């Protein structure tokens, strides 16, 4: 079957560089057109580039031309995307995709994060009471995990999607609607290796 195996992406500083890839199989890769499509948080799909199977020619979007290079290695069935002079707006999920237009086969999304922020664990403030919660503020990069009472409290929980703040740090609130027992919010941040437990008191 047509398989497309993505590489890991990364966390990069503006003006920095990254190379992402997909290992292909289940089709005649040496003669096939391969493309790169990206999706920025809260934005739509956007075409990045395509490499032509028959003659190795390439096409780019104006926003990436001169910075990004699409190449391939026929011997390993590898398609690459060398992303240089990285810009904040390059922050996205990148999909290697089969063909120049009819994208039937997609690789898994490769996350590329472009930011000047340093890795930082969140500060967990309480949302005091009915409704109560936790303010998971100033963390970088995504993601954090919010659970209540070590995972016992699962119903009536609204854990908001993170927003990127003006500071370049992320923030979200996790809220719970409860009747009238202690209430603890357990927030993990794997990038910074931080675990914070905060109990909410009225």
């Amino acid at each position: 079957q047509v398989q497309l195996q993505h590489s890991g992406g990364g966390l990069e500083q503006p003006g920095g560089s990254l190379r992402i890839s997909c290992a292909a199989s289940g089709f005649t890769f040496n003669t096939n057109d391969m493309s790169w499509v990206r999706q920025a948080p809260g934005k739509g799909l956007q075409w990045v580039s395509t490499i032509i199977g028959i003659d190795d020619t390439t096409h780019y979007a104006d926003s990436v031309r001169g910075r990004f290079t699409v190449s391939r290695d026929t011997s390993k069935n590898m398609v690459y995307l060398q992303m240089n002079s990285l810009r904040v707006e390059d922050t996205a999920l990148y999909y290697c995709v089969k063909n120049s237009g009819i994208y039937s086969f997609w690789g898994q999304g490769t996350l590329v994060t472009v930011s000047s922020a340093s890795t930082k664990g969140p500060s967990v403030f309480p949302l005091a009471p009915a409704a109560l919660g936790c303010l998971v503020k100033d963390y970088f990069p995504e993601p954090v995990t919010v659970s209540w009472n070590s995972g016992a409290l699962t119903s009536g929980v609204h854990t908001f999607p993170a927003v990127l703040q003006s500071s370049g740090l992320y923030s979200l609130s996790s809220v719970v609607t409860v009747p009238s027992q202690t209430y603890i919010c357990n927030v993990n941040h794997k990038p910074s290796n931080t675990k914070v437990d905060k109990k909410v008191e009225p």
């Binding site: 956007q46 009819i102 949302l127 609204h158 979200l172």
Partner: protein
């Protein structure tokens, strides 16, 4: 560049219904247009290619029509997995261009939001910054206007909203609007108000507190 214009931005429908999505090319793209379905956390999947040819592995319920500048997508008897975002793509020329997307959401009755306000915590004030959180719980439709007033002065540039996906059980939305202030500016004022406007509310509800 060829501009691809998708309409409407959002479609509010029920499961089992037949539905049509529109896509408009700024100039002729002949029949070289494709349709895609995108659900969060999973890679987008192809539905239609060559404007009308249904794609090889796409379900039988997806149909496409049109040529030149006006294209359509028909979803016959839509399923729960169909509540997603649909993109059209032109691949007739370079750059390849996608449409901005059409969100197919779960139609349900109007529900007014339950509004709550939260002053900054004492521990947050120990760090030179204040966060006033305003909660808008389990409402429908998604459209909600949230106004922040500090001693009756309308606030601009210091708030950010976050809204959840449709609740799997009741198909409603929840929204947080968080107001950011320096500790200094927070101590200059008394009345912190969160005024909400929604189709389910006859009059704007205001949830407030005194510092």
């Amino acid at each position: 560049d060829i501009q691809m214009t998708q309409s409407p931005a959002t479609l509010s429908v029920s499961p089992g219904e037949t539905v049509t999505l529109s896509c408009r090319a700024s100039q002729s793209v002949r029949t070289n247009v494709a349709w895609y379905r995108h659900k969060a956390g999973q890679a987008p999947m192809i539905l239609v290619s060559g404007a009308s040819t249904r794609a090889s592995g796409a379900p039988a319920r997806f149909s496409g029509s049109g040529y030149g500048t006006e294209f359509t997508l028909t979803i016959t008897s839509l399923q729960s997995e169909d509540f997603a975002v649909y993109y059209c793509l032109q691949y007739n020329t370079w750059p390849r261009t996608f449409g901005q997307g059409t969100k197919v959401e779960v139609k349900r009755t109007v529900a007014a939001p339950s509004v709550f306000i939260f002053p900054p915590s004492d521990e947050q004030l120990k760090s030179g910054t204040a966060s006033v959180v305003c909660l808008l719980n389990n409402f429908y439709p998604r459209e909600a206007k949230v106004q922040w007033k500090v001693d009756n002065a309308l606030q601009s540039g210091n708030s950010q909203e976050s809204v959840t996906e449709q609740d799997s059980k009741d198909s409603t939305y929840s929204l947080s609007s968080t107001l950011t202030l320096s500790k200094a500016d927070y101590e200059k004022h008394k009345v912190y108000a969160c005024e909400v406007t929604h189709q389910g509310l006859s009059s704007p509800v205001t949830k407030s507190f005194n510092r």
